[PDB]
Design a protein around this ligand. Structure first.
Ligand SMILES: Cc1cc2c(cc1F)OC[C@@H](NS(=O)(=O)c1cc(C(=O)N3CC(C)(C#N)C3)c(C)[nH]1)[C@H]2O
Ligand SMILES: [Ca+2]
Length: 129
């Protein structure tokens, strides 16, 4: 998507990228093509307590899709986070949007030390374009 996203995604280090990589693993755990489809997408979101749809879920991935095959990979997933923090990609309205920290809350795990702390919740951004 927007260069601002890619710039940040690539800027991420091995540690930062790993934090998100894990979430992707559990997301596409035993997938058909190791990708995130509407099936796994909603199946994971609902876990948090959501009730999306097969027609709406497609809009999410489609918006965060690169090739437009109807799925999201790791490299693409990261872009969803960088943009999520900004909240520019999409907007709530369908009952309850999804946050990078939320969607991952189920993947990585309920407990968390980073999210818990306020300082380790979110850092500034330097995307001078
Ligand atoms: C493949 C993937 C992609 C996305 C994921 C996780 C993923 F697994 O979470 C974040 C999402 N962006 S979003 O702006 O939150 C966002 C919410 C919505 C929406 O219509 N609903 C909120 C809802 C789930 C409820 N109740 C229904 C849309 C279209 N975009 C999107 O980037
Ligand atoms: Ca795809």
């Amino acid at each position: 998507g927007d260069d601002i996203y890619k710039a940040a995604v690539e800027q991420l280090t091995e540690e930062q990228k790993n934090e998100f990589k894990a979430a992707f693993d559990i997301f596409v755990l035993g997938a058909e093509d190791g990708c995130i489809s509407t099936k796994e997408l909603g199946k994971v979101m609902r876990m948090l307590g959501q009730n999306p749809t097969p027609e709406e879920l497609q809009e999410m991935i489609d918006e965060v899709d690169e090739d437009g095959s109807g799925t999201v990979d790791f490299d693409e997933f990261l872009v969803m986070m960088v943009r999520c923090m900004k909240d520019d990609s999409k907007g709530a309205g369908a009952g309850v949007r999804i946050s990078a920290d939320a969607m991952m809350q189920a993947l990585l795990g309920a407990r968390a030390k980073e999210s818990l702390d306020l300082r380790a919740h979110l850092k500034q951004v330097k995307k001078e374009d």
